[PDB]
Subunit: 182 residues, 4 copies
């Protein structure tokens, strides 16, 4: 059917003292992203938490030259932010809810996301999380190239700047043919 992808909504990307935080704009979607995730689950959708994870002793990651350390495996920075954490805790062992560690921006890159979606004959991915113009955008581009229909929940994605958030939404709708949802 459909799969909701919950991209990088962690303490380090959202919290005031997060190591790579997008801050207020990211915090602003905390209630919405939790609500839409529960709704998707209620609707029978599959839910995939696709979460940046960096190993401590890893000097071969391109990001190391680009950003300070963040989302370190084994640390609290990788905790989900807001009520979304309660959803995951409550449904940790549900067959329809998945946690996938990732190391690139796209949720598809180096993961088994496409495999799990194909097993379930999912034709549509619904994207939520941060940042609209980076991990959301890269995930959508890979989804497009893999032939998925794409929906993006506008009230449940966010970027550092409104300008970049807007560029990303326009690209998603007008280049990738995604449906932007409330």
């Amino acid at each position: 059917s459909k799969a909701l992808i919950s991209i990088d909504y962690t303490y380090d990307f959202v919290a005031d003292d997060g190591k790579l935080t997008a801050g207020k704009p990211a915090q602003a979607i905390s209630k919405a992203i939790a609500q839409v995730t529960q709704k998707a689950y209620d609707n029978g959708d599959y839910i995939f938490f696709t979460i940046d994870g960096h190993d401590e002793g890893d000097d071969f990651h391109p990001e190391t030259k680009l950003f300070p350390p963040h989302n370190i495996k084994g640390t609290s920075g990788r905790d989900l932010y807001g009520a979304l954490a309660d959803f995951y805790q409550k449904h940790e062992n549900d067959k329809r809810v998945f946690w996938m560690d990732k190391r690139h921006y796209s949720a598809f890159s180096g993961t088994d996301l496409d495999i799990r979606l194909r097993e379930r004959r999912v034709d549509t991915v619904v994207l939520t999380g941060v940042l609209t113009d980076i991990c959301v955008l890269h995930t959508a581009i890979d989804a497009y190239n893999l032939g998925y229909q794409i929906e993006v929940v506008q009230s449940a994605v966010a970027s550092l700047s409104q300008e970049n958030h807007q560029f990303a939404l326009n690209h998603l709708q007008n280049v990738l043919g995604a449906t932007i949802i409330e």
Copy 2:
């Protein structure tokens, strides 16, 4: 060695009468993209022309909902614009120069670009062509996910608007770690 990728610099994307033309901004790079391509070749680089091609009777293409017909196989719209066309004519049988038809925005999607690059142990791709924020950007994202170093020649890429061009260059540099060459 390096490979220069020449992305979609065709009549339909560049020329005044092109079916999906980016117009003056695309035309403005015509001399530079030809020069940089010849230089790369003189310097020992492989050259890959990666060009949008639509089969006439193809209603399963995702772009059908978005754009009017363009770059139709067998038509003059797929002709290379400017002096670039003479470079290709002269090297049509050169084992170091390639023409690859593509159907998605990224030059890697559904093509054998990665295979040809890996055969040659290419570690760096040099991106040129149009549009900076779409086919160039998608190609760069795939390249990043595939572990290539990325250079982008600022004078030999163009977008529909300066704003989009700038979003893309910033993303290439700050998100993908690409070297912007001026």
Copy 3:
């Protein structure tokens, strides 16, 4: 949606004078492979001819060291063998019939086969052609990893090595879970 994959059933792989011919065992399937292809087409299936296309000099292709030149681009060696040639000629412009050049053994590698199948929401591939233990096997393994259901038409696949043919059929059924249609 179903798709029938017609793998390398060409003069060089089948004919008495073919450059890498499997010989009588491959010729033995000529009527069957034509009939099953026509039937699949009559049933509404998509038909994909996935055909080795090589360059003589190519020291960058690992395969060049392993086998004599075969299926060279521009040569009669790439002609389809038997009545399959008439089928292709008659449907050369049919939206449901495709010709795809390939350079590796698998029909998926470096091609846009997965993309075309996903556009059509194909869930099952029907494999025919040669050789059972090389191109058919590699194509099947890729199809399995990409989440396709797989059928193999026993009367329409062949190898030179009958030992290897049986190994392949056993592997297809017992490892990949393919349906061997007999």
Copy 4:
């Protein structure tokens, strides 16, 4: 730059009591596979343990119709067999030693193996583990399609029969251009 791939050498695939065991033929390479892994690591190679792992009750897995439950995550069935287990324990935290869960036969499918190899500019993979004609073979075919040179250590891979072991070795050498070591 070389990487040794250690494919599926677990209790469930190897031990007498393993849930999907290949039994004696797999047990036979226990000393050789541990030894060669240690040597590769000594030569400066990267070491990747690529290990079948099934989520409990996962009915969407294609193997569900093919094989009995095996290599269940969180169970002792996924323990490495023989001295190889001591290697992993001792080198768990070593930057050059990796553990990757996989669900298809190939070590590349749905994993980040290609990404990690590319980061390190590895051009050659050295294949060990079981079974020669299934997980080893599929990994090799993926490696070939991804442009890697391939070596296969004959004394540290094994199949259910010599016939299949030999089919796979011949395929690796003659079809994929692998070097048999």
